Ligand binder design. Structure first.
Ligand SMILES: [Mg+2]
Ligand SMILES: [Mg+2]
Lengths: 266, 356, 266, 214
């Protein structure tokens, strides 16, 4: 007789990292709102990471980001249009630079979301990492207003936490947006406001940088009569409170006993 | 110009159509007239922007869930097949199933005179059809589709046939029942659900290789070898298959912070009368092992001398692990005793225990 | 020595049916435009399939669809709200009925796309099948106009065939829309206009049917001051001209030598 | 009320900020003032509608292509792993690779003083780390990530280790090189590409079981 309850041949079964699951969940949410996902380089130049985004040398703002500087000969960093871009190299402290790289190479209107790994020089603890992930969006076009920004984040809240979810915006400062704001979502099941990220209307000086640089490369300017908004958020923060991960250090810890738990999550 | 008589000065006119335009009755009818005479080309392009009414939120979860299922399936290695919804009534006989509930009054042909009650019969036919046209050495198919009986419901079904998996230039191969059961256990871990097979007979299945599938504790379908007689009538080699009813249970994520403390290992064999199902033994060792059991695995299945004849032995690698701290030997020991005790109270012997 | 070029263990590798690939390709296109995919039953009642959609008994229009009628005792067909719906049973001749089922159970505004298998009594040839698939959409809300319909199909053309693609609309008749139209896409690489499907503005009588039926079930009416547009298209037609499949009969033919060719298509 | 002196009758006013508001220089700066005093709560919700400019069409194909790759991989049976971008310079030695091209001037630690040139070294370490903490009988991992050398480029790497595939209660098993090569041929048929392995030596590989992927 054949025992049907006997274990069958042991083929392997895979799984995806908590962060990939979460990242995927956020990209599809925005895809439904017409946003396309584009990625950028991890090793950036100070120009795209700081200068173009209105964050200059010896300025209080520069203190908000703890940069890892890089040294290395014979490394080719190439700009938006495949040109050799010259600057002091660094590991990106945010995904924002990619938004300048996109604008110089494309013409408005458009809506983009750029997920990515970012680095900050910090002491890694249960809620702090030096290597983590962010997701930033950018919508540029004639007539884009703050109302449209509040609308997008509203749709984000509704999608992550339900119809009974509500967003809240308050003023905050960022060198690359004005007005600027921080947004929080009412997580109804947790009965508390969660601070998710920042956002604001692209700063006049960011568009000038884009065009000025476009002109340098021979491209006609495209950001003269447009407005636009941008927001950015941390992925780990969501991933933790959504999957219930207590220690941010698990993400890069590579323990199979941790990762395997997320096999069932699609 | 079209012949209508327009009365009024506006904003709302009284337009009475000619007697020969039987199609002009509503206002919309009239707006189409303005459109076709002006030209559809003159209608500008535009995109709408609005927040959907609340009840439409999340409305696609289902479609999305089934589409990932197909993707996970093709990922594992199953090849998708589409099969007509129609069924030959005679087939209900050839395969030993209850007769069709919905029949057509105007069928394309007699063999397409009913609506399928099961999915597998069709897969089996396309299998034969393939063998005749081309002679595949193997196949692993799957289909998701509607099935009609009492209610219309979605099913998932697959079938494995042929040589199997192994080194091409070698003869040793993995195949048949336990290979199909493998792809299924693999499939189920990915969906993150509890899968189990208890033996049970099915008219169409083979008595000796026939069982019911238990997903998350509930019977959702079967798995087994095609009954040899049906095989014979249709001139087919043996084939293994399964059929389930979708949508499968949904199990949420309960994160369990893994212990940063070392596991304790232990091996043990259970002597069991040949007919006793492996699953029953496994459940027993498990239920008795305590809250500290982490893993339980079968590494050896033996039956012969000097094992008391009519008996077999099941070797098990066990692993105990305490979350907050390391386990004291007395804890493991005492724990492996609760197993040994209930093991013998069911009438089972202990071929081995406490092996490092 | 170990010969690295020797074939390794022969694990199976799956694949998806041409139609699933194509269907998936069309649903993601609309998801980007904010449309949600919902499916409906294959076995329908004459009410939802014909009557509610303004296609009555002994009427020229009924001749456009070659219906397969069904007989069978002890079969439960349940309506939108799980109620036992009474009517003469049939295999759906189009996906449109699902659009009435949706409207009775949900309130506007919304945008939906319903892919599905449909049946027609016909003699199966190299370009004709009795069993095939359609995909229909429906957008309902305050202010939805034909311009918005032309815009959607425009976005469909751009996504399937490129920026150099253009759509064309012409008048045609459908009992359930007014204005009504047929649309064709300029397929630039094929250098010819392709007739893709139909569309129009939902007919006044379809909304009346929806509400009247809602009222019957105790739901308040919701389609009094709204407008809406709908379109529907054949999947096989696309799938064939996009993957180069010569005979429509291959789709349900189940030949492994045919299906395996589409393993690489995502 | 904020202290600005407004001149003009409209529609375009000449507003000169107080000397203590160093932050008020552009018109936008002033619009934020109207917003924060009125309250961000007063800004209504809305969604934009527009046809994107032509060059933005198809812009996501790449991201989509790589994301399906990961999905096909987890489908086959590979378990995803995330590993730090940082590398111990000494490792370039332990594994026999050319030295790192990008090094940090302010590393978190010496062992994290360089940017990885290869992916595998890290997978191999997490493998060991796993064996010590828990004793897996097997593993089949994979990682997609950035690697830095001359240019920044994306890599895919995996590793198989342990007992293998077969009947649990039997000894006959499929494993090692030809099993990994199996999962790869399987992987490649799904992507619909031609895959081939020619033998060639690699410093880090084993001479007798070493080949190049075509
Ligand atoms: Mg008309
Ligand atoms: Mg300010």
């Amino acid at each position: 007789r054949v025992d049907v309850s006997l274990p069958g041949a042991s083929l392997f079964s895979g799984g995806l990292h908590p962060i990939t699951l979460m990242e995927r969940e956020l990209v599809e949410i925005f895809r439904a709102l017409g946003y396309q996902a584009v990625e950028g380089p991890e090793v950036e130049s100070e120009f795209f990471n700081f200068d173009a985004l209105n964050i200059p040398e010896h300025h209080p703002a520069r203190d908000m980001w703890d940069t890892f500087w890089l040294t290395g000969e014979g490394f080719r960093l190439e700009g938006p249009l495949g040109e050799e871009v010259e600057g002091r190299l660094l590991l990106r402290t945010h995904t924002s630079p990619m938004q300048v790289r996109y604008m110089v190479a494309h013409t408005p209107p458009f809506r983009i979301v750029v997920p990515g790994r970012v680095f900050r020089f910090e002491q890694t603890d249960a809620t702090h990492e030096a290597v983590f992930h962010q997701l930033e969006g950018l919508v540029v076009g004639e007539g884009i207003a703050m109302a449209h920004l509040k609308g997008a984040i509203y749709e984000l809240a509704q999608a992550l936490f339900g119809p009974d979810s509500k967003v809240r915006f308050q003023p905050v400062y960022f060198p690359f947006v004005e007005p600027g704001a921080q947004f929080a979502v009412w997580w109804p099941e947790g009965g508390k406001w969660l601070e998710l990220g920042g956002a604001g209307m692209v700063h006049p000086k960011v568009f000038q940088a884009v065009d000025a640089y476009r002109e340098r490369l021979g491209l006609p300017p495209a950001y003269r009569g447009v407005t636009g908004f941008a927001f950015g958020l941390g992925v780990e923060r969501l991933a933790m409170l959504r999957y219930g991960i207590p220690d941010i250090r698990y993400f890069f810890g590579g323990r199979l006993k941790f990762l395997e738990q997320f096999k069932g999550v699609l | 110009r079209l012949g209508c008589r327009v009365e009024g000065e506006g904003p709302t006119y009284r337009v009475t159509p000619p007697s020969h335009r039987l199609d002009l009755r509503l206002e919309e009818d009239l707006v189409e007239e303005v459109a076709r005479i002006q030209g559809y080309e003159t209608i500008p392009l535009a995109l709408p922007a609005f927040f959907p009414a609340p009840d439409n939120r999340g409305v696609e979860a289902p479609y999305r869930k089934e589409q990932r299922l197909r993707e996970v399936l093709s990922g594992l290695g199953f090849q998708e097949v589409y099969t007509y919804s129609f069924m030959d009534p005679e087939d209900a006989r050839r395969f030993r199933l209850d007769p069709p509930r919905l029949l057509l009054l105007n069928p394309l042909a007699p063999e397409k005179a009913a609506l399928r009650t099961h999915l597998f019969p069709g897969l089996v036919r396309v299998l034969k059809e393939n063998l005749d046209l081309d002679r595949p050495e193997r196949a692993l198919l799957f289909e998701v589709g509607r099935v009609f009986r009492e209610r219309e419901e979605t099913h998932l079904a697959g079938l494995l046939f042929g040589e199997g998996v192994g080194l091409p230039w070698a003869k040793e191969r993995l195949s048949g029942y336990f290979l199909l059961k493998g792809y299924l256990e693999a499939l189920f871990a990915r969906l993150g659900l509890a899968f189990r097979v208890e033996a049970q007979a099915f008219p169409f299945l083979h008595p000796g290789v026939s069982g019911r599938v238990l997903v998350e504790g509930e019977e959702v379908g079967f798995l087994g070898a095609l009954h040899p007689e049906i095989a014979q009538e249709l001139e087919l080699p043996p084939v293994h298959l399964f059929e389930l009813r979708l949508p499968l249970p949904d199990k949420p994520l309960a994160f369990q912070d893994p212990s940063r403390h070392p596991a304790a290992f232990r091996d043990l064999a259970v002597v069991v009368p040949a007919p006793t199902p492996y699953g029953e033994v496994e459940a027993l060792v498990r239920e008795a092992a305590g809250p500290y059991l982490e893993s339980l695995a079968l590494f050896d299945l033996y039956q012969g001398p000097p094992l008391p004849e009519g008996h077999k032995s099941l070797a098990f690698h066990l692993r105990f692990r305490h979350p907050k701290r390391t386990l004291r030997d007395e804890e493991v020991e005492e724990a492996v005793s609760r197993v040994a005790e209930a093991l013998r109270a069911r009438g089972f012997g202990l071929r081995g225990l406490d092996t490092p």
